[PDB]
Design a protein around this ligand. Sequence first.
Ligand SMILES: Nc1nc(=O)c2ncn([C@@H]3O[C@@H]4COP(=O)(O)O[C@H]5[C@@H](O)[C@H](n6cc(-c7ccc(-c8ccc9ccccc9c8)cc7)c7c(N)ncnc76)O[C@@H]5COP(=O)(O)O[C@@H]3[C@@H]4O)c2[nH]1
Lengths: 187, 183
Amino acid sequence: VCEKGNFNVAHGLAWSYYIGYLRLILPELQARIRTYNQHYNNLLRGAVSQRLYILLPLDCGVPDNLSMADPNIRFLDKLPQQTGDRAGIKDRVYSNSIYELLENGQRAGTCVLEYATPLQTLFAMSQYSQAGFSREDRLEQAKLFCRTLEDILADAPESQNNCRLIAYQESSFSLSQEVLRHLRQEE
Amino acid sequence: FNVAHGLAWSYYIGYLRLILPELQARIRTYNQHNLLRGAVSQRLYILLPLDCGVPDNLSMADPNIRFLDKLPQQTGDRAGKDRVYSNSIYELLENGQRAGTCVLEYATPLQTLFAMSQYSQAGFSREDRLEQAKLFCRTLEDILADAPESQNNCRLIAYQEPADDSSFSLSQEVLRHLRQEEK
Ligand SMILES: Nc1nc(=O)c2ncn([C@@H]3O[C@@H]4COP(=O)(O)O[C@H]5[C@@H](O)[C@H](n6cc(-c7ccc(-c8ccc9ccccc9c8)cc7)c7c(N)ncnc76)O[C@@H]5COP(=O)(O)O[C@@H]3[C@@H]4O)c2[nH]1
């Protein structure tokens, strides 16, 4: 019933997110985006941004369909896939989805956008009795996850201007506006 | 309580509860586009090496475990489109000849506990790793015992291989479970 427990849970999930995904995809991400831009997206104001944008809703409410969370977020395409032999599974697949961000009926941005999948584990553990966690535990673990992940990425050699965390609290809220603000701060 | 609790819950929530309900069907679609060769056990076999030593290719754990084929892929839109869930069908050799076939893999979260033991910023000792590996196994087993998505469709094999022990055949151990099952 302590924070040390809320800390250990988030610490492990943040490391898992780095070890099993970010350290493996971030190094070839900008090649994949550059490839996409050069070959399949010659739109001079429509280029896919060079960073993976990771949505960290602090209530850990993660829809599976991002486009449905905002009429102004439209699925556009997938990057070229990346495969790996992982833990005795041949060709485990790593894929990333490109979204268009609309504003005043116009395209305002294009980016690789996704929620941090591990927040779904923090939500489930808040909902399942066997896991033994309260909403207040979930909110603490979500904050500790984002902080651990930032500290990890700040020192990680695979993170070099290719990743951006978007943490926010969540009706009146536009997720596209939340991402557009971060995107527009890049260039 | 600790790191393993989140890892065990993550493995159930993000993988087992999603793939196990559909596993039985995928194995039939495989057997309909393979009976003359030998049927694949209808259960996902998950290896839990407690030393957290998890080669990405199983033949390097034991050369008698050979990749035969990949089961039909399962794709799911997850956390924002067509995330692919893939599984690998292996043959187990006895005296250079196929003794069995199953869907077989390591529990990937054990590689996290290993890499955490290796990164200074994780503050994770090798004693922490063994302790957390056992907690992972027990937490996962406790979850799967009450999980509705596990209806005789999964088998966990937890084991401690001591250092440099030629007395251990992973192939034989899996075959022992496969032979016990058919009985
Ligand atoms: N965004 C993202 N894409 C990835 O491809 C990926 N891969 C690992 N991770 C995270 O990195 C951390 C450590 O990973 P790990 O392998 O160590 O532990 C895993 C693993 O044992 C098992 N498991 C999970 C997956 C899996 C498949 C697809 C997605 C996904 C999610 C959002 C997307 C958004 C857009 C496009 C594509 C998207 C794809 C996520 C997980 C998986 C698989 N395909 N085959 C075999 N076993 C599997 O369940 C454990 C917990 O899974 P969790 O879902 O919580 O997400 C894990 C985890 O938190 C990923 N995140």
